[PDB]
Design a protein around this nucleic acid. Structure first.
Length: 56
DNA sequence: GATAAGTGTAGATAAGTGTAGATAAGTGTAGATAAGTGTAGATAAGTGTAGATAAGTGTAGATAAGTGTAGATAAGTGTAGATAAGTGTAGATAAGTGTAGATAAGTGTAGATAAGTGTA
């Protein structure tokens, strides 16, 4: 995720419209979806592929 | 004390100015062509007039912007326990200062050579 990467390089989950401002729950849902992608799943599990392994 | 900078003094040539004559600048004068203006006719700018199409506005119906209303999840806050920040307290070493003796900075003092100035 770019969110945690100070150089901004990575991926992000975003609202579609550039003009919208995200609601209080939407900002958290977007962070959850990012985390889900990183973990490739709901829970953390070292036995599962990371997103890096998936992409490779 | 010895020489030559610095000034007054005497003569020889050519700058500097007045004077006299020869040519052509500078101005008035007379004639010949074509600038400059008034005058007459021919074409097409400039304006009013009449008809033909489509800008411009009001009117009527169909879909979906815009708002109120009802339910489901998870932001947001108070409450209870577990570890380690944060402070006081006791002992061990070495910063920090006063104190004692050895060497050489720091100053006064005596004599020799040469800038330092007057003089010929």
């Amino acid at each position: 995720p770019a969110r945690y990467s100070e150089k901004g390089l990575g991926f992000e989950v975003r609202l579609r419209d550039l003009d919208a401002e995200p609601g209080r729950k939407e900002k958290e849902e977007m962070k959850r979806i990012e985390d889900f992608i990183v973990n490739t799943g709901k829970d953390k599990d070292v036995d599962r592929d990371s997103f890096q392994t998936f992409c490779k």
